[model samples]
Target chain A: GLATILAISTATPPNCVIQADYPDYYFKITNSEHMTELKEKFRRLCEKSMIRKRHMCLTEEILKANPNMCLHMGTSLNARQDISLVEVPKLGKEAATKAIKEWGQPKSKITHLIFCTSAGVDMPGADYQLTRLLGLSPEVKRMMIYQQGCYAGATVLRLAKDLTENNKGSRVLIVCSENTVPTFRGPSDTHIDSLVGQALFADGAAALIVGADPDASIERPLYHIVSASQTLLPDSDGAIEGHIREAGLTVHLKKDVPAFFSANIEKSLVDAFTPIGISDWNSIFWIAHPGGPAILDQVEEKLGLRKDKLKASRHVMSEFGNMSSACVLFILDEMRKTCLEEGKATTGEGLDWGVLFGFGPGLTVETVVLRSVPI
Target chain B: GLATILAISTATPPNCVIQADYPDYYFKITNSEHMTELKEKFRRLCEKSMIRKRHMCLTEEILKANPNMCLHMGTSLNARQDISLVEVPKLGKEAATKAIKEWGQPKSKITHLIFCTSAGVDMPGADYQLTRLLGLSPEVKRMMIYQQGCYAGATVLRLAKDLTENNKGSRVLIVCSENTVPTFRGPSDTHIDSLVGQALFADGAAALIVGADPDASIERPLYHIVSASQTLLPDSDGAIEGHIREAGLTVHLKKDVPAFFSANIEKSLVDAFTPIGISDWNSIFWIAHPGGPAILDQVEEKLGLRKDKLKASRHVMSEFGNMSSACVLFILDEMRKTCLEEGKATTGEGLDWGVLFGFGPGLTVETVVLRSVPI
Candidate 1:
């Protein structure tokens, strides 16, 4: 049984502007002398409260960074104020229903529903939520993947590929959403890592439709996944950590992540491609997860990838800092943009091969190989 | 271009149990006159302290459900506690990494990591977390789907289906996890629906490997997904809701949900099967999401499904309550049990068709068609 590995589609929230009219007015005092006196009083209060000075400084920095200054600051602010704030289950249902209507061929044709996320634990979870909301039967064989982080999108791709390949007729759905804003913890001096953490991160969601349907056809579609590989590092526990605490979740990162990734990733790539009999790098299209400028740069340098290969990744990161698990979908979305711009034509099977990959804590790397389809 | 759909392999956590044992020393203080006096005293204290009566009752319930009672009254009074409180990300990473390694054909073939969870949010999120922990590439595209709830697993499955159906070659890794214990808000008093929630949810995680590869061959697989349909019912916004509040997440289910689902679900299922020319229900193996006893019964009665068709669903519910997104997988696991027990031999392409369905808020129904691979 040959499983059909199809194209990848992606979506993102519309970008918004950050208004600078307020300009730290909330933090500013009317009188400078009074502000200094207040600061001194707060310092004394902190001393009495056993508050770390660095934490106070980080808090100040967070207030100063006030997304209002970022390019998408307005978008964040607008989202905070105007977004309907749908319940987690409701949002998932809406996203799934809309995605199926827009992209699905039929309900009975889909073999599995692989719901993935790491935000909230709602019963019926996303699967039941979608079932009840859309009036589907309770008999959908479902596989729910959570807490694996941003790389899960690629992970879902891998699962779909394997399921479709081994089974004759199978289709899988990969949906993801993260509310990073609310999960954000205030800065604390005791945790130096918290300083950099408070500076970067955001909230976002992405829905993708993937499957193995041999009869399905497309025109100028996105890239298809080829093969996928996941690797867990030997001793990189300190690189990234997400832990629950009394204050809330504490997300810690080691600044040397880029260096760590660079040192070991090239071998993994070689191992992944070796099986497929592909030794040349120039022939492959790269859809890399944009961890940030540092990680992306290391990937490009280590792989010796073409400059234009990572345009989609760079664009996504710049537009949206890091949508986490949803970031790769954004990159894939960008690839769709390229397809739309290039007006690539395809007839039956010939399409470009693309490699999609993401890195996560535990220093794990997940890779997927995909081919492009005509939409 | 013609898209090739391939069946992917799936993996789930080994069956495990929480080690924490509660004492059985609960006293039926309900008959004691002192209990009434104590309740009155507590009410007065709460009123004097400006606490609402509801809060007092909630406190009392917590006390009643306290682990101390289980410890005090149980026969194993001196039992040592070796409780394992599995963290979401850690559990998810372990399951995902193992699934990828055991079911995954090679080390680096995976290109995309799609992480899904609605329980907790991490910084680099799960993608980065898995990458760092597992030593995956910084080059892999990482995407995080958070806050979407349980259906996210199926949603991710659909996304992968679409991606693979459009392209000829691609692999995706999908991971889903939920930590229900921590997220459990003590039983709600205001709504019966709320109080029932506490008794109907559990925690678990699953990882799947999906893609279409012509060269790789394996034996004795599950089912391949075929077509899929997702639909959202209109004017049913209040059916199910999950919201984050100061106290934690408040999950609500309208009493009319069972009736609401029964009224229109059959039509949706018919519609889902219509595209695949599968109107007859006799041939399909149904894998339904187990929302609860009432909801499951309604689905069976409304759809006219055969007896024992939903045994897996019922078994999962009785044993594990509702594991949110993991429930469907648990059902699938139970079905696997039947297969294993019956010594069902499957070839590369033996199983014909199966339906995977789930419902969520927004009154949505998601259905997927699948074909099984022979052992």
Candidate 2:
């Protein structure tokens, strides 16, 4: 009873801005007075971040005026007002509609919708919003992972898999979208330590169709659901925190998060993999959450992996800077695109087994095992 | 495959304020301005609401300047600040502990926890907070239905049932808690329509244990989950809206909501029951979300139910007002208490069949079919 990941699709705002220009540009437009030092550091970090253009869902001009704006480019709510609450649903719907369009499934036939987000929130959530936007069934059961931070995508993927396997003919739609840029807490003495968020943390809506329909069909090498596990580092809960406040949503990412994640990651991975009989860790490809360069570097060093092992993950971050919960989906989507374009999916150049790892606020590490089945 | 309802328990704060005195008390204490007329109508509404007393986690004295307030209760954040954030978790945990205690199950052994809440929210949510408090596994898989609104209890119960049935030996804890009084919207022109919410909603934390262990050697006459369905009504999205604004959390309940809920409810109930082979509606006992007196009356009148069928629902409303997502669980608790005390359960005088239903923001009607199996 395995759920098959048929295909993946991703959506981003039309604004694909250069990540390199932010620090210098923000300094110039934002009064030019107080944030000079902060902007100076931001420019330096982006210069070396390995990231290029990222989808921000807002214009450079808008970003300059309202760094912490919400709903519109947004009336900006007390929380993440620049991310306009309405835009999130509209953009995510387009992304999800396209995902289903590519999968060739009826919009009205989806049985379950698991919307994972740590950025925007609306009552009834994006699940209900998408159900109406996509014409999903009235019976579509909705679940949301709100404010769970980046790793929520992995948790939701597991849920989609469980729901599919437990109920025959269940087609679960998993959507992870984040417009977390406005949520970055900045300015003043302590803001310098939180600069990594400015380098990454963009917006994206990435959706996948995981169905119990056990056929390989056209999209060959379906990512067969294998095994997954999650570990909570009780000690590191404060390493990363997303809080909703009167001014808006604020995020705290400690400078020591990379070291903290590295400390607890290996034992956790083995805990997830050992049970699934994957004793040889080197036999697998790695797909890690592109949280930051340090996190990727640290995990690669500890896992004793080759440099290019996490190519897709780093590529996603470099292209989209980290789309929070949607980063992992983009990685998978990129993998599918390359495989389809290059026609290596059937020839074993794609993948045999891969493991996905995501990090977030609970100081939680959520992982899933994937096996690609040939066409 | 059925998941048996093992036991139910509820917790409330010490202040059991009489609902009857609220109208005058509110008028006296609140800034006696243009609200004079509205409070005049409020006094009349509360007089007929059928609610006698309701519990508040905060004291009656503190609720003064803070009723209809969120975040801080009077001061707030995405995670609550004034209420200590931990209090919601602590109160809900005690209710959950008592639920499992009555079921004769140790708190440490539970496999999954599904926490449902619309009133209060925090970063890690009650999921992480209570998991640690109750000594549930750190590995305890957690799923939270946040901001989904009232019917989320029914939604989570179905998930609990699905998990218990699909995974053998799985026992899931479902907790629905709300301290929603502070969340009512007020004082403006459109506020008139929203006043019913103030009259009905209060605070409560109710919990239940659902498991695949069919044999109730300890808790007799297990309530077997038979069937369940959820339907999201079309074009009524705004009929009920839950929003988190800078002022705090606010709910907009349209005056026509009772009619809107009742309109789609009957067909929705049959949609759930017909598949489970229930053709006669008159044969079973009924449990409904006591959203308010109007909702209850409309539902009863529309469904052609006898006055006594929804006794538990009506009784729960009178005793605790509307506990939002926690109301249905409290009703179920009261039903159990009555059966155990009267000896009717063991004597076969208790109902063998029951149906539970709840409504939330989608103008959604979620219903569950239940049967009591005498071991």
Candidate 3:
């Protein structure tokens, strides 16, 4: 009767930007071509980004229309929030519809909705809009979480686990949508974090259906959420930070983020899995947030994991960059599909137990102990 | 074992403004005295607001220092966010420390932190800051909810109920801190909702300790949370709304809010209480959010409840105005203390069962069924 992930689906905006050509396009669109040195620096960052391409809500047309958004001192939050108001839920609905289809349950059967996003802030939030968009029940218990960072996907899973396990016949739908348009801006010499965000952040949405004691006739359990916990690394608050300012959503990701993850992740992994009698790092599959190449590298190195353990993480990173909170669920979806496609004995590449890592601001790490059920 | 609210504590900022003098102070501070008609209208609204006094983080000195904040044309969100970044957690810490003390447990016993606020937005959010300020354990699981409206207090309780009951031995610290500084602005002719906000919105923080299977030796249960659920009234999206904009947070409350509540609440009550076999409305004590005097009157009339049933809600509203998500805890605290003082047989005014209602944006309503235990 454990809480289990019934299905997962992800959606991305239509506009795609290749990493190799992004610097030139970014500089051209933002009118930062005159800043040759910064452009060169950005080009170098993109070259080493390990990301093939990223989906963005900010199309070239959008950038052309919103010139102020590309200005250094532009107060374009209103415009950005406006775009997200339309896009966040639209994108989320796309993913949610797919997740619900895979779950094979009537929308009316969803008793709870946990919608997490850092894309936008609004009254009658994205949760409400998505609920209406998908024709969800009016009596659905909904929790709208806003302004959380990349770790929010796991946070939602953790919340869903408790809600479903504790409330019999409960079905929780989790939706995470990130529109990086709020954080979009031209290059700035003084803002390295902004450059990192530009280099790695993207727009996407992910949805999952989670419940306990699923009806076997129509239900399918993809992954059983065994245990979920979060840990904030001490004094690492400065590692990653964000804020909603007059300009737009500002993200400050320090280079030491990977180091922070490396320093504390081993302890977190041990603390999470030891109680379940697990010690070997390589025995379980990994579904870690593809925050960046360096972050995944640090996690892999620190845990002494084989390269294949993070195949899904690296692939998602290469394909999608970091979609903030939505990125982790994309990783989970990627890993699960790959596992099934590979004809593995279990969903976790033949392993019974795995761990999903969600790292974000506060140097917070959310670890969800997962048991991969049979496909 | 049922999840129980072990203790509750509330805190307010130092600047207490009497409701009678607020119109003059507000107009003077915002330099809108020249708009005499609007001033008089605001004065009338304040007169009818039922609030006697309100504590605000927006002191006269603070307001005077930040003139742009008062200007409708000014983009002063950064300044407001900075103020909230400091005040939200500081206020929450004050209330949390008191709640922990009342729980008679070491700080380390708190396994989870559910920090809800409509007051601020930050990456290393108020949840992280409060954790550091209180020196709580690094491993404490934290959920930071931002931009949720008044219903968030009940939302957090619902979240805590499941987390605590499902986890066994888990203690959740629920902190709801609201600072109205973001919503403060000069009177505008076009925006009546703004005037309503200025007339009644205030600042405060409320903290509660919740857990299941409490240690009878030290922990005490103030209210047993029998059940919790939330409902979004159909097609009521425009009834109440809020958004973090370039100037500051904008709340739009349509006049139909009371009508929506009145039309839908009876059905919600029947659906919620019928399962528990409670048919007589008068048999259960009532603890409802004092959203406004008219809203309260409508709810009272619709439900045909006795006047004394909502005394605690009215008293808190009169004393403290609406503190957004923090207000419900104040109502609960007032109800508990009043019950004890009157030598009631139980905390629910000698009644065995009660219901706490939270109303907010999205026309969302949160209901938590309560069973009173001995004081």
Candidate 4:
């Protein structure tokens, strides 16, 4: 039996900041106005970011309390982790509650939980807290993949597919939460990567319910997960990296990232589909992680895709920026809703077959072949 | 078809610390001679710890180079992470190399890699590095479960079982590495948990190869993984906790941990076996994680098992101390070696059925029912 997505839900903090106004707000809050050159550099990046607005968990009140974070003091991870300890689960609970409600099943039926995060690091992690907060069964097996970078959403989905298929009558919950507060710091002349991070990364949590052999009377399957595969680009490990330092978790993206994607995306997609006799790219719908405008553009051009083919990814990036691992789930949800509203034959923009991509550190590219069911 | 352990191997750093001499050696090197009371207290804990000797990656040169770590200074995580980034993979590679050799298959035949660590937190984690070090295929799917606490060994095995069973002709490499350098610190009077951590935790790496439908001519199966389940002790979240602070990762085990295990061990095991129609506990073999003397004792007493039932776990603890998630793998290897040397009918001390337990933070109890294969 193949595993399928039964429901999807996404949540973000209430504090939304427009990208156009972020440069001024970010400089003022971090007290970096004195660095005009850096601010100007950041302003330009924000302008070209294509993001209209983004939700953040780092509100003014929290920033005021953690001056060390704003100042880029060396010993600030304690404060950042303290905030994530609470907010990661708090936000994840909201997303999970909605997903469970959409699935229309009692929480007790959920037999497994796979939680992924780039912003959380603790024992009795956000997975444990979510189990308590969502009132999940104490026997629910939980697996926490922490600091897995952006592709973790696809990682969890790939894992859930197998767990659900192998275990008879089991339902798996997949949750990914990201908060930029862990990586937030004052911009400096020496570190453009941090500036780029501030320009793009945001906060969000996404949840999905996955299971095999769903009861058609009560459970509506969204998409059938056909197969999941991952490939690492040779010699591309340096392209995307994340490290946890004392200040907080930091991510670095080399300029070659988009080039790496461009070089590998087409081959990756073709190889992923070859096992299932898929060759023509245009026949399938596309759901991709909105890593950035450049990545989306690279994937689009390399595949010779029509502009509208990647509209779902672009729309997600425009509305929410990059939410790390959580971004892919939002894209999945966006595609589902848009397909239904447009009266498409299936949830995959009228295409029965589709592909989902999750790109992250290790230059890892995760591809899941999907067969969309009728709306 | 059940997933089976095809091979197992364990590795440890060359630096071995004898338990009897560690008290004097530890206090002198850490510059803690002035704290006589704390030294005396730690010495008493070590006396009763049951650990005879342990290996560590923190050699004298490392401790000498990082005075901040020895002093428990504030900004020491940078040093610890730097050391772990290299040692974690180095140790894991050794174990994985041995396991792969024993499995007698070319590295390219491996389809999946599941790496778990309580001592690692990074993007492009030790899993990625290991793939490079071991020259695994670029197409091998990698899942990194970082900071998953001690039960992570069982977690990876459970995940691998599903992946191999669901994906035909797939082999999974399960690797777990732990280094105490991240949690090492000078003893203080107030933090007894830290003292306990110091007394028990050591460094090691373990690896296993798992797959289903193995070719009998070329592959040997040691234990067939029949069933895997996890249960969290109610209201026991506070019993075992780990936090990543500015200094490094700090683990806290409450005094009630043994109590929690004792209270829940019987019920958890019974429920795990009830589905298989097995109710007589004395008939099955036991391969439990050697977390500590108290934990093993409590489990033995609560289950009403004979003294020799857990001899493998006790031997692992005495030789290697508690190596966190890696301990269970070592115990599995120990059991296999001892059973074979003794000419037992099967690898599980002649017993056909066995249960493996992995307990960690969240008071998460992972149970795996195993069927021993003929020698």
Cα misplacement distance, residue B17 of candidate 3 (Å): 0.6
- Ranked by lDDT, the better of candidates 2 and 3 is 3
Candidates 1 and 2: which is better by lDDT? 2
Candidate 1 vs. true structure, TM-score: 0.57
Clashes of each: 268, 20, 0, 0
The DockQ figures for the candidates are 0.10, 0.53, 0.86, 0.86
**Which sections of candidate 2 miss by over 4 Å?**
A32-34, A61-83, A181-186, A215-221, A342-350, B60-81, B181-190, B214-221, B345-349
lDDT of 2 by residue, B1-375 (tens): 678888788998777779878776555545434676778788777877899988876554554545544222233333234463566677789799898888786777678888877655556666877777787876677787777778876787778876777667777888877885436434444465556666777888988888876554665435777766788886787788766665556666665878887787878777777776675666776778886678889988888888887887899999998888888888877776676677765211275777889888878888888886542
TM-score of chain A of 4: 0.98
TM-score of 4: 0.99
Q: What C-alpha lDDT values do all the predictions have? A: 0.53, 0.72, 0.88, 0.88
Off by over 4 Å in 3: none
Candidate with better TM-score, 1 vs 2: 2
Give the range where candidate 1 chain A is weakest over 10 consecutive residues by summed lDDT.
A49-58
After the best TM-score superposition of candidate 1, give how far the Cα of residue A150 lies from its true spot, in angstroms: 5.0
Q: What's the ranking of the predictions by lDDT, best on top?
A: 4, 3, 2, 1
